[PDB]
């Protein structure tokens, strides 16, 4: 199944989570504070931990066949050296709702925070080893397979 990879934007991503970036975002003059870019929510009396995931770059062509989700907590990933990366998300209360399945490629100035219970693909890098500043709990996530998806970058 062809899965088109489109540019990431807050507008297109809003139903899946928050896009962490400064472009055209409101800020307070203090230092310029670009506030409330993402809301971290971790329940089940779990801790909110900061980590770094060093991911190897994946090579084209890319195919996926499963998605994971964190039912009781959000998960944020922010590249540490301006790297571009790819994300795949889907909604769905008990399983991925294919009509909402989408893929996005960042612009190098963005991070993401997946809302709780939102389906996404395990972390992987693009074109180069990337260190992702990670904010989540701390494996207690749900794993569900989906029909093979062929990510498409052209067009």
| H, E, C per residue of 89-112 | EECCCCCCCHHHCEEEECCCCCEE
Question: Taking the complex as a whole, how short is the minimal distance between the CB of residue 26 and a second copy, in angstroms?
Answer: 11
Q: How many residues are present in the chain?
A: 155
Measured from the CB atom, is 55 or 87 closer to a second copy? 55
Measured from the CB atom, is 3 or 38 closer to a second copy? 38
Question: Taking the complex as a whole, how short is the minimal distance between the CB of residue 114 and a second copy, in angstroms?
Answer: 12
| Cβ proximity of 134 and 105 under 8 Å | no
Under the rule (CB under 8 A), what is the footprint of a second copy?
A: 18, 20-22, 27, 30-42, 46-56, 76, 78, 80-82, 111, 113, 122-124, 131, 133, 135, 138
| Cβ proximity of 108 and 83 under 8 Å | yes
Measured from the CB atom, is 25 or 95 closer to a second copy? 25
Question: Taking the complex as a whole, how short is the minimal distance between the CB of residue 92 and a second copy, in angstroms?
Answer: 24
The token pair at 8 is 């990431």
20: region left, alpha or beta (phi > 0 left; psi from -120 to 50 alpha): beta
Question: Taking the complex as a whole, how short is the minimal distance between the CB of residue 134 and a second copy, in angstroms?
Answer: 8
Measured from the CB atom, is 8 or 20 closer to a second copy? 20
């Amino acid at each position: 199944m062809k899965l088109q990879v489109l540019p990431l934007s807050q507008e297109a991503f809003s139903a899946y989570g928050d896009v962490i970036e400064t472009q055209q975002r409101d800020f307070f003059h203090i230092v310029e504070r670009y506030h409330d870019l993402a809301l971290v929510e971790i329940l089940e009396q779990d801790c909110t931990l900061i980590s770094i995931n060093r991911a190897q770059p994946a090579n084209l062509p890319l195919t996926i066949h499963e998605l994971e989700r964190h039912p009781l907590g959000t998960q944020a990933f922010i590249p540490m050296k301006g790297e571009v990366f790819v994300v795949v998300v889907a909604l769905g209360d008990d399983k991925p709702d294919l009509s909402t399945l989408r893929a996005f490629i960042t612009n190098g100035e963005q991070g993401v925070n997946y809302h709780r219970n939102v389906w996404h693909h395990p972390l992987f890098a693009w074109q180069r080893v990337t260190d992702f500043l990670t904010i989540d709990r701390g494996d207690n996530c749900d794993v569900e397979s989906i029909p093979e998806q062929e990510l498409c970058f052209a067009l």
